[PDB]
Amino acid sequence: MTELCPVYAPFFGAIGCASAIIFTSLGAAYGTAKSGVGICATCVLRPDLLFKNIVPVIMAGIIAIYGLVVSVLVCYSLGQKQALYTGFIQLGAGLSVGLSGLAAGFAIGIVGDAGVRGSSQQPRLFVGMILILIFAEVLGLYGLIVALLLNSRATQDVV
């Protein structure tokens, strides 16, 4: 096509748009699985703490929502005649939000399992679990911020 806008250019954008939702879904799945095993082991004895312990599963689902947001915003910028600059920016944004969400999902799963099993026998540990899970949530938030700041520059003054 053009030296600035070759034909292989939408490949990187499609790979980024896929990899965002892929790695955030893997992180959310690990968090949901580990925390759900912790809840199902805990709430045999205290079934009244069942809907109180549901917090790590929700904080794992917010990561998949982050990946969905970045995948939609990248997907509405693909084109047949785009540059390599746009594809590289889209690939970087996808990798950023995906691997940040993967790390945050691993941390949320492990901390949520330990916190539910500990708060079954100590009622003052639930707020400490919430604090550590918020510190695990802001990592995926930082990945979302870096992805949005990349995506805001993908089409400024590109020829």
Binding site: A41, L45, R46, G118, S120, Q121
Partner: protein, 369 residues
């Protein structure tokens, strides 16, 4: 102490050896001894329906309900049940109960699957509620002749409706039979229900005959035994037709364990509320919420709580049911305990009920309370 069945089809195999396919000319073959008047009593189960309105007149399970009608040792408890049935079959009040359980005698794939996963889970709970209810009538003070086969019939009937829920949910999910007959043949294995009399009905609409090992005729018999007696129908002011069908009604209601003060009106409808005057009187309303707590916190708490209540010890329920289970935590095994957290308000309401009647526990297992 009240029931002992068997499954020996080889002890009296002469009655099932030859191809006996006639209801007539079977009483001479059913004698088989020097006893005549008591061999006719075991033939009385199928004899009023032995000629009128039936296919082929000898189905292969209609003999084992007549062979194992064991009146050879005892001829008193079944005769009392036979003096009571067909004396209960006279009022329209039994007949209008036997007409409520009967007729006249894409995104749409996620909805239709959920309607049949709800069917498989409600009937899977209610089946389990009769398995821990046939070991409450095993406790001393109860009886087993009327209580056991009435609720063994219902637990078979909920096992078939639960099987039709997820067989239908499988064939709708894998598309958008022979499996229902494989589970129907499976639930007839092992034990079998005790023999209850036939409950014939004769009126102006015809001459009907139900079976009492059907889950829909059992479900209409207990709705008849529910309500209390009134000022009429048991006084000697009305000797017309009442005292032979009302004292037969009360001798079954007492045979479950329900005193004639106990009302127990059902609940299921398509309306908002039921009525005003037949409401439970807040001592059993607080107590019925305590039994529903015992059904839905554990699979094993209803039997040792009724056992603790027949002794008058229904204040020690919070301590006699507590047990400990392990838990892998971040510090090791901890061995925490699970207790029924009955509040003091509903622990007092279990005292004013002296003993739970078996009729009250069977409405609870059907969702009618």
């Amino acid at each position: 102490a009240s029931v002992s069945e068997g499954v020996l089809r080889k002890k009296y195999t002469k009655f099932f050896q030859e191809n006996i396919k006639t209801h007539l000319d079977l009483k001479q073959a059913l004698l088989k001894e020097e006893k005549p008047e008591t061999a006719l009593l075991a033939y009385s189960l199928v004899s009023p329906s032995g000629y009128r309105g039936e296919p082929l007149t000898e189905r292969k399970i209609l003999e084992v309900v007549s062979l194992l009608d064991e009146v050879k040792v005892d001829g008193d408890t079944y005769q009392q049940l036979k003096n009571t049935f067909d004396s209960i079959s006279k009022d329209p009040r039994m007949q209008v109960s036997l007409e409520n359980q009967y007729p006249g005698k894409g995104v749409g794939l996620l909805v239709a699957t959920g309607r049949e996963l709800h069917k498989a889970s409600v009937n899977g709970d209610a089946e389990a509620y009769h398995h821990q209810l046939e070991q409450i009538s095993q406790l001393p003070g109860r009886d087993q002749r009327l209580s056991m086969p009435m609720q063994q019939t219902l637990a078979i009937g909920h096992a078939m409706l639960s099987a039709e829920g997820a067989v239908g949910a499988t064939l709708g999910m894998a598309t958008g039979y022979g499996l229902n007959n494989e589970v129907q043949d499976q639930l007839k294995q092992g034990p079998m229900s005790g023999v209850l009399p036939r409950l014939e009905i004769s009126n102006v609409k015809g001459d009907f005959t139900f079976s009492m090992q059907e889950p829909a005729a059992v479900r209409a018999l207990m709705a008849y035994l529910g309500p209390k007696e009134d000022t009429s129908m048991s006084s000697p002011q009305a000797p017309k037709e009442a005292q032979e069908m009302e004292a037969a009604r009360l001798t079954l209601k007492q045979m479950l364990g329900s005193s004639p003060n106990e009302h127990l009106v059902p609940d299921v409808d398509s309306l908002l509320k039921l009525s005003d005057e037949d409401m439970p009187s807040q001592t059993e309303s607080t107590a019925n919420g305590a039994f529903k707590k015992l059904l839905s916190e554990d699979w094993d708490w209803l039997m040792p709580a009724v056992r603790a209540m027949d002794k008058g010890e229904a204040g020690k329920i919070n301590e006699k049911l507590t047990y400990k289970l392990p838990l892998d935590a971040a510090n090791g095994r901890v061995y925490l305990d699970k207790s029924p957290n009955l509040s003091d308000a509903q622990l007092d309401a279990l005292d004013k009920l002296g003993s739970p009647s078996q009729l009250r526990l069977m409405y609870l297992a059907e969702g009618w309370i």
